[PDB]
Design a binder for these strands. Structure first.
Lengths: 133, 30, 53, 49, 86, 136, 115
RNA sequence: GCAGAGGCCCCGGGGGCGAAGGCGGCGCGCAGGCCCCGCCGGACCGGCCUCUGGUGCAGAUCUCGGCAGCAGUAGCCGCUACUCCGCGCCCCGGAGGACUGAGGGGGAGACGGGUUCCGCGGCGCCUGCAUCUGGCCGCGGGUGACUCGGGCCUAAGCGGCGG
RNA sequence: GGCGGGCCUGAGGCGGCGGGGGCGACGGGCGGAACUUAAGCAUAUCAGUACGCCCCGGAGGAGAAACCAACCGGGAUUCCCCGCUAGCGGCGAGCGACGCGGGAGGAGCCCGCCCCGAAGGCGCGCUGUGGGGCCGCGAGGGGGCCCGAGGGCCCCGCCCGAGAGGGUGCAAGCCCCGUACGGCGAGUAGCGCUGCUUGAGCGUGCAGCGCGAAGGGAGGCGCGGCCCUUCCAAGGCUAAAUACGCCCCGGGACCGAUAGCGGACCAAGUAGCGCGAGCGAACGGUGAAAAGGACGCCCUGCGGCCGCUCAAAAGACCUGAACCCGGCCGGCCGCCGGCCCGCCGGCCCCGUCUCGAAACACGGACCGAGGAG
RNA sequence: ACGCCCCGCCGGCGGAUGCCUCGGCCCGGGCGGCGACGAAGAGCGCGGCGGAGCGCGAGACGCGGUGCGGACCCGCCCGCCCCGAGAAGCACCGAUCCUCGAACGCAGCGCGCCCGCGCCGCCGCCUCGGCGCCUGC
């Protein structure tokens, strides 16, 4: 049971925060389980989802693999390539089905140079914690 | 009424206006 | 609550009930009026805690 | 009125300039679903000042 | 003639706009603001109308200086002051 | 002289006890009034004390000692440095000078003064408070 | 657009000349907007940047000129609040009369334990 | 009977294999009420023991919201008036007939309103009938002063003044 | 007499520094009601209240005894527990302290006088200065069945210093965020007369005036005497415990959209209204996803139809009640009873005060929500 | 036929009843931090497309500095995209800060005087007044 008075267990305050979170918080709230292979290499369980990451959906609806091309931060959902709603007519612009970051596993990360630094910081702190404090 | 002892309670003063003449002890355990 | 408004009884001859009404003629300041006070407003002076030996 | 003071005229000007409806792009950007600007006035029905 | 006929001679501006509160309450014959109190240095604030005090009090507007000082007091202004007291 | 209530035409309507406009007596000495009058004329100075100088049938003159609480000598003098504290701002307006203290009944102590100690208003509030404790 | 880091080491004359051109480009951009634009937004902020750098230098040189002067200008004075700027220094507040201070030294505070 | 609280509901209460609600129908109870069944509905809901209350409505010239019959009813009667043809609207244009009748239904100002002004496009709203009209709606524009007025002077007044 | 200086009282200007105005609380100073209670009403009560005005501060005010007491005595203030009774009062209705005792918290001092006198804060001053919080990691779940989508079921696990909670396409410890665990003393006292005030009663505190001390004050019945006990007024400072809105934080046997603030809704003190002071609304919800409606046929167009997207139109929105209404189908139609069911028999409009109401007494068109020990 | 009644069946009109709920409300803590260095408040202006709100102030829907943060920026654009290049976001700090307002050259939007200009208080200084108390010629 939570023993920190400063954290709130109020449904209203918790749901107010979720739906009014600042973009830095919103981004870490939008995290996905790294794949078993990627988890072993980077030694971290979850990474915040980013454009160009390849994710596989395990949830039964609209389930497939693809690259996130769009992160809809305001609705806390991501658009995977290939995950699209049925079009009314064949010759029409595809409409993406929004998928919750939680519903997918990150098979490949867009590595960049900041992400290399960020995944290293997280693993250094995880080393101090895994050294039993 | 009948056989009762007349109350020696003074009537409440400044109940809806004026100085707050009612104190509450919910701050006691704090 | 319910007492923040200015309402007075319209009077006795305007074919309306004598309950207090706002400038427009809107029922106010009563338990049966929408936006009116509770007839007996709840209060923190209730003894919340009992006593045991 | 044809003889007004600049101060009176300037407040009246702001009232005319801001008596406008929500821009159509703002309705799209904000996803409003409440198109009317309720602060809009009409000279015949409204009394400014 | 007390009613509609009398209301046809309404072409006067009894009250204009106050320089300090902007309300249509500044008497033009009396040169005083029914609400602002202007020309008086003090504001016209009456404890009978709490609803007139919740209409134009501290917190109705921007509170630019106050918000910035209160925020700074939470950060580094108390310490700059302890430096000045020395 | 005595005070005459400011009621228009001399009429103080209402209950008969509250009638009567001439011959009422001020609740504060004229010494206290003299110190309240120099406070308003000069609100940049703090009042220390006042003394009787002279009297006539028409007027009574009192000299008031006031302190500039922002002068270098006063701020750095440990004896008068307390006047510079902000809580001593316009002390006459809060009845804190000797004459004001007499008028508030604070020269008297013991029996006679036990309902005027933190203040007359405060004593009434401490006596008329309803405690309503938790384990009443 | 421009970066403040570039203009910080520029002559006050060079910054003054750069503002003149950026303000003439703000006339032409306004003129083309009305007559018939990322540049307009960029040049508005560029005028702001040059103006921040011009002011910072003059305020810095002026601060330095009146630094170490009795009665320095009010803009260059510490922030504080009206209440703090009228308060008594903790040296003035802790000043005690000679007799009272002597009795403090005569009877110094001590540490003791009662069993 | 309602709404909460603390427990229980023999492998841990009933629920997208359908919760509450709603509608129709049985049964059960002297009755308040309850229970089931079908249909709609689409996520919650209890039975019992203990505890708690802003706890039950036909009424109050009750409050607030809906809204019926009257009822296609009363009404749509100041300001003399329109008609023909042209795509043809009560709009426009031509032709007739007329009106306001120089204390005009005429041309202008002061005040008050504050864009109503103009031009173009429009009929969703208004224009108490209609509209293709407009004082309406959308889009774009419009007020230029050494000589006019403000400003200036003083009026009745109003303020200010060591005090 | 006229011209210079010093002193003393003024006058204008310049510098440095301060004041002013704000905040629906808490706090200090003042001025100050009435409704009301007395079953009428004047004193009284309301109430030393509303409100008006002035003034601070993070608290304020109070404060180191001209105190209380009467003891086998205490010992500045403020605050809490207690007695509510001593008393006051058309001795009516009402009103009303304190000391002792238990606690919270505790902390003491200065000036004038006096002595030196410029040793000083030295343009002054001998009419006296000086000195005596931030930053972070953060565990552990699969299979099968069905769904539009499990967070459902049905087996089997795993983590737990974490089974607080929130999010996720349905009820999730293991999908995600988090949570548990961590680092960095004189015009005075008094007295006389007067007004206000208090429980203070031949005066509790205050004040106007007149008069005015010297050893003086107090000991709760005035005066005169004599003792006793106990203190030093008419100058000043002081922390702590105590109070409390705005604002931030957290919690709740709270409210759940006519409720809860007036205000849950991109734009509420808003739209609107009043010359003005001021008054002041209403309006929550599509879905999992905007996927917000494919195509074709018809029409002068609008629109209509066929469907389409969806699990579903849920189509400007969840559910979708009653009142009321339209189409179609059945019936001649109020309630209670007996029968197959349209006859026979019974039946005034309730609520309400009232001796008595169907009343030509009063309220009630209807419905729904709210609505009073 | 109307009107009712309702034996079902299906439409409307309405918005009850559910269920929810980024809002109240009460209770604790904390805080106690405004202003002539211009507050509180107000008026105008400011966005590429810009009505209201919020925010800003002619440097205007912001700008600089320092640290984080690490891909986005509601629409159409634009700008980014990269071991740093640097979007959302996040503190803290420095500035800018129109007109009115205690409101300060005088007015309220109009007019000065000087090369900035309000009042009151305190403490200094400068200039000089008095048949005030004196003194020398």
């Amino acid at each position: 049971m939570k023993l920190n008075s400063a954290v709130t267990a109020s449904r209203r305050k918790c749901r107010k925060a979720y739906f009014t979170a600042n973009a830095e918080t919103r981004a870490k709230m939008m995290s996905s389980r790294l794949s078993k292979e990627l988890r072993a290499e980077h030694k971290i369980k979850t990474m915040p989802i980013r454009r160009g990451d390849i994710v596989e959906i395990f949830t039964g609806g609209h389930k497939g693999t693809g690259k996130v091309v769009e992160v809809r931060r305001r609705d806390y959902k991501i658009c995977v390539e290939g995950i699209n709603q049925k079009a009314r007519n064949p010759e029409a612009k595809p409409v993406p089905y929004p998928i919750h970051p939680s519903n997918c596993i990150i098979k490949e990360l867009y590595m960049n140079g900041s992400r290399y630094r960020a995944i290293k910081r997280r693993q250094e702190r995880n080393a101090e914690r895994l050294a039993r404090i | 009424g009948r056989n009762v002892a007349f109350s020696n309670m003074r009537r409440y003063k400044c109940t809806n206006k004026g100085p707050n003449l009612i104190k509450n002890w919910f701050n006691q355990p704090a | 609550a319910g007492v923040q408004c200015t309402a007075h009884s319209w009077g006795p001859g305007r074919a309306v009930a004598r309950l207090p009404r706002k400038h427009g003629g809107i029922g106010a300041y009563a338990n049966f009026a929408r936006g009116g006070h509770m007839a007996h407003p709840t209060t923190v002076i209730r003894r919340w805690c009992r006593k045991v030996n | 009125t044809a003889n007004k003071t600049l101060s009176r005229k300037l407040r009246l000007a702001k009232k005319t300039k801001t008596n406008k409806n929500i821009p159509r792009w703002v309705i799209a950007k904000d996803h409003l679903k409440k198109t009317w600007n309720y602060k809009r006035h009409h000279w015949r029905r409204s009394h400014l000042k | 003639s007390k009613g509609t006929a009398s209301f046809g001679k309404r072409h006067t501006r009894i009250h204009g706009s106050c320089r300090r509160c902007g309300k249509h309450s500044f008497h033009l014959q009396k040169h005083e603001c029914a609400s602002c109190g202007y020309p008086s240095a003090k504001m016209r604030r009456y404890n009978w109308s709490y609803k007139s005090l919740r209409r134009r009090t501290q917190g109705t507007g921007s509170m630019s200086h106050m918000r910035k000082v209160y925020r700074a007091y939470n950060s580094g202004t108390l310490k700059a002051n302890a430096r000045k007291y020395l | 002289g005595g005070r005459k209530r400011q009621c228009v035409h001399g009429i103080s309507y209402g209950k008969p006890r509250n009638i009567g406009i001439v011959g009422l007596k001020p609740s504060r000495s004229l010494r206290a009034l003299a110190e309240q009058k120099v406070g308003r004329r000069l609100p940049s100075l703090r009042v220390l004390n006042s003394y009787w100088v002279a009297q006539d049938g028409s007027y009574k003159w009192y000299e008031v000692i006031l302190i500039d609480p922002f002068h270098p000598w006063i701020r750095n003098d440990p004896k008068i440095n307390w006047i510079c504290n902000p809580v001593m701002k316009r002390r006459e307006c809060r009845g804190l000078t000797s004459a004001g203290r007499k008028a508030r009944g604070l020269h008297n102590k013991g029996i006679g003064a036990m309902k005027l100690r933190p203040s007359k208003r405060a004593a009434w509030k401490r006596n008329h408070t309803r405690s309503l404790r938790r384990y009443r | 657009g421009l970066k403040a880091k570039d203009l910080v080491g520029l002559s006050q004359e060079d910054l003054q000349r750069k503002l003149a051109d950026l303000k003439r480009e703000l006339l032409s951009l306004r003129t083309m907007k009305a007559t018939a634009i990322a540049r307009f937004r960029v040049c508005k902020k560029d005028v702001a940047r040059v103006l921040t750098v011009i002011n910072q230098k003059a305020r810095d040189e002026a601060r330095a000129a009146f630094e170490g002067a009795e009665h320095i200008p009010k803009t260059f004075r510490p922030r504080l609040t009206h209440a703090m700027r009228c308060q008594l220094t903790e040296k003035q507040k802790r000043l005690l009369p000679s007799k009272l201070m002597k009795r403090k030294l005569q009877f110094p505070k001590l540490k003791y334990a009662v069993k």
